[PDB]
Amino acid sequence: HWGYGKHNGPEHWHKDFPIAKGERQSPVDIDTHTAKYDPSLKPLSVSYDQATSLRILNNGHAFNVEFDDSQDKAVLKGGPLDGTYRLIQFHFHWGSLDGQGSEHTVDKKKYAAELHLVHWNTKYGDFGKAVQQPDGLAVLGIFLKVGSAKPGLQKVVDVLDSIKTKGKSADFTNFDPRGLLPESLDYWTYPGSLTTPPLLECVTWIVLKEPISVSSEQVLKFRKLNFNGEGEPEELMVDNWRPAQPLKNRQIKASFK
Numbered sequence: 001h002w003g004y005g006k007h008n009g010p011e012h013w014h015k016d017f018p019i020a021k022g023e024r025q026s027p028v029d030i031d032t033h034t035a036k037y038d039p040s041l042k043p044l045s046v047s048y049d050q051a052t053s054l055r056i057l058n059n060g061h062a063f064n065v066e067f068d069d070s071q072d073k074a075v076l077k078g079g080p081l082d083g084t085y086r087l088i089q090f091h092f093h094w095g096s097l098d099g100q101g102s103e104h105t106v107d108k109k110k111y112a113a114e115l116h117l118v119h120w121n122t123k124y125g126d127f128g129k130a131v132q133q134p135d136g137l138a139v140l141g142i143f144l145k146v147g148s149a150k151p152g153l154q155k156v157v158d159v160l161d162s163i164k165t166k167g168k169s170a171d172f173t174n175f176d177p178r179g180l181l182p183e184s185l186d187y188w189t190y191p192g193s194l195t196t197p198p199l200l201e202c203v204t205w206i207v208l209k210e211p212i213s214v215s216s217e218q219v220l221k222f223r224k225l226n227f228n229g230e231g232e233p234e235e236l237m238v239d240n241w242r243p244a245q246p247l248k249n250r251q252i253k254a255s256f257k
């Protein structure tokens with residue numbers, strides 16, 4: 001029953017998920033002047049050459065592109081991380097307008113959308129166990145701005161008509177998530193949470209500095225999705241973003257000078 005509407009949106013979530021007002025909640029505003037360069041941070045290692053995409057699902061909140069995470073096929077290592085994080089799914093958050101949609105902000109700047117590549121720590125064996133651990137997840141966050149098309153996104157945009165409503169899924173094999181990356185892997189990193197209920201404080205956030213460009217037509221097709229199930233009143237899936245949460249006792253570190 002949590003959602004992004006007038007009556008079940010982020011300001012309501014604390015009533016069922018009290019951790020909503022916790023000490024390490026996500027997203028946050030990235031104040032670029034206060035983030036400290038950490039020369040001890042390693043380059044990120046994104047190893048997606050063997051990625052196996054399986055399926056795309058409208059879950060009533062976003063759409064997830066799901067991967068085979070039963071082996072080390074698509075992993076994130078290095079940067080702030082200790083050990084190996086396996087890609088399980090990616091999804092986006094986006095706006096009703098180009099002026100909003102991202103969850104993270106940069107000097108209070110909102111982007112049109114934000115991609116989340118979600119990875120779990122293989123020392124915890126499965127995703128359900130990982131989300132119970134302070135270092136269980138690594139989420140790679142990538143900002144989207146509207147401009148030139150992202151060629152590697154179009155296979156996602158073209159299948160959305162087949163999963164318009166909540167609970168619909170479609171086969172989505174041989175998708176290469178490398179086509180969603182910017183040129184540079186420069187990043188900010190801080191400890192945080194899932195940005196949807198249950199808002200567990202289990203995430204190392206790695207947010208890329210360089211946004212990707214998508215076309216107006218690409219993001220317009222995201223905004224044709226539905227939050228509702230088939231045969232229910234149409235509610236456009238837009239503005240599925242949580243706003244910036246208090247930083248509290250946390251330091252955002254930069255991989256770059």
Ligand SMILES: NS(=O)(=O)c1ccc(S[C@@H]2O[C@H](CO)[C@@H](O)[C@H](O)[C@H]2O)cc1
Pocket residue numbers: 001002003005007008009012013014015016017
């Ligand atoms: N975010 S949360 O999990 O704390 C949560 C929040 C709200 C509710 S009731 C709410 O009422 C509204 C007007 O009737 C309806 O329009 C909403 O759909 C319905 O969800 C239930 C749970």
Ligand SMILES: NS(=O)(=O)c1ccc(S[C@@H]2O[C@H](CO)[C@@H](O)[C@H](O)[C@H]2O)cc1
Pocket residue numbers: 059061064088089116118139193194195196197198
């Ligand atoms: N925005 S975020 O990157 O912080 C984030 C938030 C939550 C999860 S998982 C959990 O389970 C599934 C997804 O596997 C989904 O179907 C569920 O709805 C979702 O709540 C994962 C990442």
Ligand SMILES: [Zn+2]
Pocket residue numbers: 091092093116195
């Ligand atoms: Zn997300």
